[PDB]
Amino acid sequence: SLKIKTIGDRCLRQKSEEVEFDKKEMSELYDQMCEAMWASDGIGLAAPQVGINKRVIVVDETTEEHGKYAHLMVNPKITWKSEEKVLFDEGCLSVPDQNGEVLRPKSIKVTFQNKDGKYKKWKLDGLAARVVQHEIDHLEGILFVDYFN
Template sequence: MALLPIVTAPDPVLKTKAKPVERVDDEIRTLMDDMLETMYAAPGIGLAAPQVGVSKRVIVIDISPEGEGPNPLYLANPELLWVSDHDASYEEGCLSVPEYFGEVARPAEIRLRYIDRENEIRELEADGLLATCIQHEIDHLDGILFLDHLSSLKRNMVLRKLLKAKKSHSLPSYAAAS
């Protein structure tokens, strides 16, 4: 496994729609493993392939509480089948938008279909933090950042600060990418 550089906003790869994978083979499994190692090292609870500069519809997630051991989810080509009518709000952050957080409302419950690490088609129902994390990562696959859910004033302020930090190379070490 290898640590991958995390791409930070406003890099254009983060605004590009990722391509579906044909199948989960050894190459995709290696990508998933490297993404998981990168996510744990950052540290984070979710990571999408575009965040490491790979335009593929691949996500890894682990929301296990600290001390309980890892319980990762490997999702290729995740597709929302259903979302609830009621929303839940969480303060979201993002490894591609280091040190910034914002309150985002998303559907509280979801059902999705995806291809797992063994190339099997699965369905999953999720609520709470897991539902939020899955939706956040699927947004990455569609070229959407959590900042896009905030007011344009706050979004533009954060993006200006990130661009300035990128130019001065003052981003956290896990975020110094590409």
């Protein structure tokens, strides 16, 4: 099963590579990433956090109505960010026992390939916009603690 790597591991600082979508590969990776995310009470996860330096993220959207669900986003790319920013207190599964208030755009538009390999573009706000930005930072070798200096 996947093990979440923590600060000190160079895999967290190596940028991740664009993916040629392979439906069976991604289905298995999705299953394992979701398992690792939920097992540690996370609400998003990026492939480099489990030692796989490929541009793949999962984003939780669990609800009372539908139960556990997560989005797969393959090659997520931000095409637009709101001018308005918001402060939010973040923690990271790759950075034990640290937290802090991070300023990021409130809303974004993001393209990606989904679980079925379909090309999507979504406008996101609130927590979803927040999670996606945190996860794309991982794909660029950025940890949220880098924003404090």
